[PDB]
Design a binder for this molecule. Structure first.
Ligand SMILES: N[C@@H]1[C@@H](O)[C@H](O)[C@@H](CO)O[C@H]1O
Ligand SMILES: N[C@@H]1[C@@H](O)[C@H](O)[C@@H](CO)O[C@H]1O
Ligand code: NA
Ligand code: NA
Lengths: 573, 571
């Protein structure tokens, strides 16, 4: 039998469980004595989908409120030791994820090459140095990619920056966060914001990618978009709202406001932050996309991803300018995003990706974003009726994530999703579909998991329904547990913490970095009702094995925001 | 009953031990099997100095050569699992240490300030941006410090660069190392080389330090030297040979030589070899003119001699000019003359002329021997080579011999020291009453420079019994850093168990892939052993001695595990 727990441990006042794999009671042992301090019943959870992990039982020990080190015991079997602590993830992992970012900054020969990279199909070159390498196996740099699939665009570099700046603001009133940490976090954020600036063309649009076809060659780097697993380059590099640009604009607009925060004056200075520069860039970008967005989209049509990205842009632009103009912009985008919530014979209030909702929204990087954008909007909406209607849509959407996760046996509380394959029907699932508009792409979903963690914690301060708040706290903690080793693989996917950290291709020089997070677990390669991580048939196949162990900066960035929102809410009675 | 092992594991063909602390025989258990593959006797060991750790037993499982995961069991006590593998530390930790250096680059507001730092005592500003923060609690950047004590100067930033470049060279003939690792390694090395360039004045001397009085303030950063625990600044910032400048010249000269290596034209490129070599020569010939004037007591000592030997040897390899061979011989003769004998030891290293003050060094005690081995690669004259080999053999014997003088189950590398008001004596740890009047700390960088020495010797000497004892000494000192110590504490952050932190409550968190100062003697009892002892653990004036990270430890560990990798098939 096997006892599975969060490898690091549990937030002191958080929801707490362990999962037993076996063929009637558990004890909690205080490590100090080795004596049982609480007895708990086993709750059978039965079989999951076609995971074939056998029988499972959950052990609920939420009532354990007292800090220290502990183990779970069932019969002759014991879990590994874990910690119960206030601010546990913030205290133990936040610094390491910052060092991860700093370790992944574009530098050396790549930085040298990016000061003069060719623009695809032209003989011009541009200075786009800065930012971060995208992945443990990829020194390219991205606003987004998968644009040709239309519904799959992940927010990549700009999301890192918006998440870091968002975390910086949440931590501003935290007395226990040191100013040296603020120096480190705002440095990483503004380093990213400086890259966003360089990625902006004088007409106002942003470049989508600096892409080397995965070759690691300096001469091959080029500003472009690309398609397919073979990385066919194209001149379609103007980034539309859903292609990283709306988040970039939101990020620049938030950067422009750092002056409003007391820490900004207080910490050591060298010259002044570039505030007007960031604000002016974000405005120019925003208005240029209001005119041009359609022409930059692969199918010429805006979808839910444009509308959430543009809602963040317009919300941050309103916050930084206080101009009614941007609040009208935000209201318009909120209304379009709200109209994506729909109902059908399977689900009430799912998210639609397209206009008639025959294609559900699902998203392996950022499925919490529709809700997070409505919550950022609610922080600015002073009109009582607009606020109430929006709160109803938000509450529906939070109930949808909880209803779908709880629809089937799910001891791990893996966040479920409503999906559709290109040649399949709408159905609920644990993991994204393998047969999708890209024709190849799917991978572990840690960033999506951390985005839904961030949404569940952000709801705590936004919604009014205590019972939903309380279900969301539980949901957020089981999501967090999964990333940190409470999963069928007993595998902590935050490198440097916990046990069984997976690598990528260290034998080829492509080692995962401490502080980073990997793609993670997917469905089976042959069986989509299954579960897999580096399955034996494909584990050595370089065309496939990146789907599991490779690190990718959005997982890190979403994780960093997730734990910061957990820290904000850690005293939530 | 506690069973102590290397928390990571053991090189496949290395020396392998565990240490049982109790008041039987042992089994090795294959994890995969759940059952015993070797049965081994416990050798009893006495009490150690005054560490008060009870009685101990060692278990030698060297014979185990099958890659896999194992545990040790004695009675019902089990060790944690550990790994046996070929090139274990290289495959498991080398990448992390490079990420640690990149995470420690001077950046943001400090980089901005360092483009216009004032020279102490004047209003002249200079651009000395780049390099690395020296420690997890210090954003100052250093060639060296402690210059006022004369005998304690550590090689800091320059040593990172020379170690990485030397590692890059060792790895050139290793087919299993990937080119992308080469890209990353040489990038961090030449990043450091670029900083060494900016730290050189037009006249040819290097600045010793960019120092903020530990304030973290951008306004307080200035080019200077400083003295005492209060960090009083002075305008004595010209670096003599022992104050980082010898090794910086060595590093610049090595950097100029990269195009001789086939990987350098093979790997991706974009964008200074003659510039590095010109700086090295200029710095060298400058200090052959000015050195004594930059030294606090105006007298050169063993440290100048090993740092200048490194400089001149590298300059000879990069230029093939005879005067540089002549220079190396001269420094090699000076260095060799520091090996002295007295009533306590044959063939100890003397810091001063008469040997009344022995050499001991918390950052770099392997350097006298290393610099002679470097010199041995270039010496074509048979009788000089032969005389040098014997002094190097006597030095290597001295290290083994002093280490085993006394009960030492952990094989902690011992040393010949002298306190300012005391007599010459062997000890485990450096003395607390020394010429600085305050400074002493864990010795991880020293430990790893002696690992580096032990493995470098494998290719240099001829004596197979000494080669053999060196391999064993090297693996035991490796074990100590990685958790086979009385604290059951791995000091490489992100690996093993019980990693120590520094001051995370104040935002000075230790970094993954870095190595902390480590274990010392007791605060009150220098015959004791301590790490964050109760009485001083929360006192910010004292606790940096244990948990703080410092870049020489990581740089010496990086080179040590690369020399182990070179020698990993040496039985
Ligand atoms: N271009 C790829 C992405 O498609 C992938 O999602 C990421 C993480 O594996 O690696 C980048 O190299
Ligand atoms: N100036 C101090 C050193 O003297 C000390 O050796 C190192 C590591 O603790 O920290 C630096 O901040
Ligand atoms: Na486009
Ligand atoms: Na000097």
């Amino acid at each position: 039998m096997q006892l599975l727990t969060n490898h690091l441990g549990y937030e002191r006042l958080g929801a707490k469980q362990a999962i037993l794999q076996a063929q009637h009671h558990a004890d909690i042992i205080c490590c100090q004595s080795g004596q049982s301090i609480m007895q708990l019943p086993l709750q059978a959870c039965g079989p999951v989908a076609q995971w074939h992990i056998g029988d499972t039982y959950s052990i609920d020990f939420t009532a354990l409120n007292i800090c220290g080190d502990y183990r779970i015991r069932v019969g002759d079997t014991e879990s590994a030791s874990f910690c119960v602590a206030e601010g546990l993830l913030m205290q133990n992992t936040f610094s390491d994820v910052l060092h991860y970012f700093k370790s992944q900054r574009c530098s050396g020969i790549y930085e040298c090459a990016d000061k003069k990279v060719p623009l695809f199909g032209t003989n011009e070159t541009v200075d786009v140095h800065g930012g971060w390498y995208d992945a443990s196996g990829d020194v390219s740099k991205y606003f987004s990619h998968l644009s040709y699939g239309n519904y799959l665009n992940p927010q990549q570099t700009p999301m890192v920056v918006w998440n870091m700046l968002t975390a910086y603001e949440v931590l501003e009133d935290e007395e226990s966060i040191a100013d040296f940490t603020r120096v480190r976090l705002v440095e990483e954020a503004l380093y990213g914001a400086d890259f966003l600036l360089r990625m902006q063309h004088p007409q106002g649009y942003f470049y989508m990618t600096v892409f080397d076809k995965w070759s690691k060659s300096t001469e091959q780097r080029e500003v472009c978009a690309f398609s397919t697993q073979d990385g066919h380059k194209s001149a379609d590099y103007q980034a539309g709202f859903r292609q990283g640009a709306g988040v970039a604009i939101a990020a620049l607009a938030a950067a422009s406001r750092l002056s409003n925060l007391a820490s900004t004056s207080r910490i050591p200075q060298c010259g002044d932050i570039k505030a007007d520069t960031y604000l002016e860039a974000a405005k120019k970008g925003y208005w240029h996309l209001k005119e041009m967005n359609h022409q930059y989209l692969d199918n010429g049509k805006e979808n839910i991803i444009d509308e959430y990205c543009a809602l963040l842009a317009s919300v941050e632009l309103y916050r930084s300018t206080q101009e009614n103009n941007f609040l009208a912009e935000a209201r318009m985008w909120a209304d379009k995003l709200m109209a994506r919530q729909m109902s059908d014979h399977n689900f009430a209030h799912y998210w639609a990706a397209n206009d008639d909702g025959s294609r559900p929204y699902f998203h392996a990087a950022e499925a919490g974003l529709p809700a997070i954008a409505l919550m950022q909007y609610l922080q600015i909406e002073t009109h009582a009726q607009r606020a109430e209607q929006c709160q109803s849509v938000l509450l529906n959407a939070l109930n949808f994530e909880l209803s779908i996760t709880h629809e089937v046996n799910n001891p791990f509380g893996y966040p479920r999703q409503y999906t559709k394959a290109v040649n399949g029907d709408k159905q609920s699932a644990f993991f994204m579909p393998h047969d999708n508009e890209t024709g190849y792409w799917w991978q572990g979903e840690n960033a999506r998991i951390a985005s839904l963690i961030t949404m569940a914690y952000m709801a705590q301060n936004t919604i009014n329904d205590n019972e939903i708040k309380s279900q969301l706290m539980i949901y957020a903690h089981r999501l967090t547990d999964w990333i940190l080793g409470l999963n069928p693989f007993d595998m902590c996917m935050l490198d440097g913490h916990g046990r069984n950290n997976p690598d990528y291709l260290p034998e080829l020089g492509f080692s995962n970095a401490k502080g980073g997070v990997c793609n993670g677990i997917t469905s089976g390669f042959e069986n989509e009702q299954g579960i897999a991580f580096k399955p034996e048939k494909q584990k050595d196949d370089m065309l496939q094995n990146w789907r599991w162990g490779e690190q990718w900066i959005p997982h890190g960035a979403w994780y960093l925001l997730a734990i910061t929102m957990q820290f904000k809410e850690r005293n939530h009675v």
